[PDB]
Structure 1
Amino acid sequence: IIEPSLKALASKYNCDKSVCRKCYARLPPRATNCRKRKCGHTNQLRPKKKLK
């Protein structure tokens, strides 16, 4: 059972996240800069890949 409501619940935490290109760190969806200070707070992000 996928269940329409409970699928959207789990996808909020697992799927709907951005990722930093330099350090591969997980980030919030509408962020502008990476929070890690090792990569120098870079502004080069992308969306996490969709499943099929």
Structure 2
Amino acid sequence: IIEPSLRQLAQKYNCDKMICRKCYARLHPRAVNCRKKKCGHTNNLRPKKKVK
């Protein structure tokens, strides 16, 4: 098993993110708008699904 601090560190780059509900782009956890021009910088954002 992965040590918890390393468990959390890897999740910071893979899991703890926000997802656009129009272009699915990976966004930082504090995102309020998507950064991709294809969606018109929408505010329709959802958290990235967790395995738990």
Question: Which band: TM-score by shorter chain?
Answer: over 0.9
How many residues matched?
52
Unaligned stretches of 5+ residues in structure 2: none
Equivalences for 1:30-41 in 2 at 5 Å? 30-41=30-41
Equivalent position of 1:49 in the other structure? 49
Aligned CA-pair RMSD: 0.7
Percent identity of paired positions between Structure 1 and Structure 2:
81
Please give the per-residue CA displacement for 1:18-51, whole angstroms capped at 9, x wherever unaligned: 0000111110001110000111010000000111
Gaps of 5+ in 1: none
Give runs of ≥4 in structure 1 deviating > 3 Å. Answer: none
Q: 1:17-32 residue pairs with structure 2 within 5 A?
A: 17-32=17-32
